[PDB]
Amino acid sequence: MNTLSPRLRKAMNTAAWAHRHHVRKGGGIPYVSHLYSVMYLLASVTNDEDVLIAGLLHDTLEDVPEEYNSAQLEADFGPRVRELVEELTKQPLKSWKARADAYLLHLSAGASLEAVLISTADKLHNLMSILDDLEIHGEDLWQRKEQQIWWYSEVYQISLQRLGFNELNKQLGLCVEKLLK
Amino acid sequence: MNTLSPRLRKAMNTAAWAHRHHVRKGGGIPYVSHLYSVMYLLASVTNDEDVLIAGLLHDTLEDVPEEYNSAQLEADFGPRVRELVEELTKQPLKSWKARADAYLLHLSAGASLEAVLISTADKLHNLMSILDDLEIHGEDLWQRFNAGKEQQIWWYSEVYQISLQRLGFNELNKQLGLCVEKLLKQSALEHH
Ligand SMILES: [Mn+2]
Ligand SMILES: [Mn+2]
């Protein structure tokens, strides 16, 4: 388990600050709940502090670049973290399917092993959150499923193909299995 | 390392929610960064999920009681979590030293080992935060810190001695001891 270094504490503070007005979809929960959860999931599988920090910051460029842009990211955490985060910042294609296929194509071929690990943690927590929401609110949550089953199934297979079996894609599989049931 | 369970996820969201507009003193950093840092620290030393949850929620009753009270803490996370968080409550004395004396007395005997551990993670992250600010803003923050550095050194070194006596050299006490000596070197470098 990585120790809480000055650099890691700075990333934790930056993630909270940059997303301070950012909310998880469907409620009022501050978005940093998700970022911290992704970092926590990554800490069980890597020693790479750059990977933990890019986990904390992997949505900043996409979702709050008015608060924290790529230049600031690099000046605070260096070029490697900025490249990891930029691997995961997906371009604005119009069609959902098109964006999904483009993410999945990149994930299977171009993305670094480090990027695939973060993406596994990212998608795992998102699916964990979906399952929590379904249990709390019920089958009507979908109006806000078969597409989602395909999406997380595809992420799970690509994660296995690129990384082999590990603690993160293990849990993603368990979540996909519940989702299928 | 504990898995991220539905209950731990709910604690994570609850801590971020209750403190959503709470900011750490001296800056603009949302307070939840302290809470998750404390939980991450606790996750390196215990597998007790109630302790991780109490770590996430340990400042709710004190700092944002209008957002989240003890009845709700118990409804959401059960009586053991609520008891753990309430173990850290302060005496209602205007005097900082009197409150500090009472809290240390409690930590040394009456507090559960679990509450000592949570308090250790809390004090450790707070001292780490002080040291971070001293290294990045040593320009003028040391001016503000000089007048109370004696209080700070006493406070953190006393918490450290009690934590060590009750818990031994776990990972958090190894780090806390170091941070206390680092605080001393910072006082030393400024006297030199
Ligand atoms: Mn994400
Ligand atoms: Mn605290």
Q: What is the DSSP letter of A178?
A: H
The resolution in Å comes to 1.9
Best probe of the B interface among A33, A39, A171, by most B CBs < 10 A, is A33
Mark yes or no for CB contact B40/A9 under 8 Å.
no
Q: Are residues B84 and B54 in contact, defined by beta-carbon separation less than 8 angstroms?
A: yes
Contacts of B2 (CB under 8 A, 6+ apart): B8, B43, B47, B49, B52
Ligand 2 center to A147 CA (angstroms): 42
Q: Rounded CA gap, A99 and A178, in Å?
A: 25
Q: Rounded CA gap, B122 and A50, in Å?
A: 25
- Please tell me the distance in Å from B18's CA to the nearest CA on chain A: 9
Q: Rounded CA gap, B8 and B11, in Å?
A: 5
Quick one: which ligand is closest to A127's CA?
Answer: 1
Identity of the residue in B1, B17, B175 whose CB atom sits nearest the CB atom of A1 = B1
Instruction: Identify the structural domains of chain B with CATH numbers, from first to last.
Output: 6-191 (1.10.3210.10)
Experimental method: X-ray
Going by C-alpha positions, the residue among A150, A181, A39, A145 that lies closest to residue B1 is: A39
Residue A23 β-bridge partners: A30
**Is the CB of A138 inside 8 Å of chain B's CB atoms?**
no
Going by C-alpha positions, the residue among B57, B41, B43 that lies closest to residue B128 is: B41
Q: What is the DSSP letter of A143?
A: G
Tell which A residues from 39 to 68 touch B, by Cβ distance under 8 Å: 40-41, 43-44
Q: Are residues A79 and A70 in contact, defined by beta-carbon separation less than 8 angstroms?
A: no
Mark yes or no for CB contact A37/B175 under 8 Å.
no
- Burial label for A155, CB within 10 Å (0-12, 13-18, 19+), is buried
Helix, coil or strand: residue A23: strand
Mark yes or no for CB contact B17/A30 under 8 Å.
yes
Residues of A with CB below 8 A from B135's CB? Answer: 6
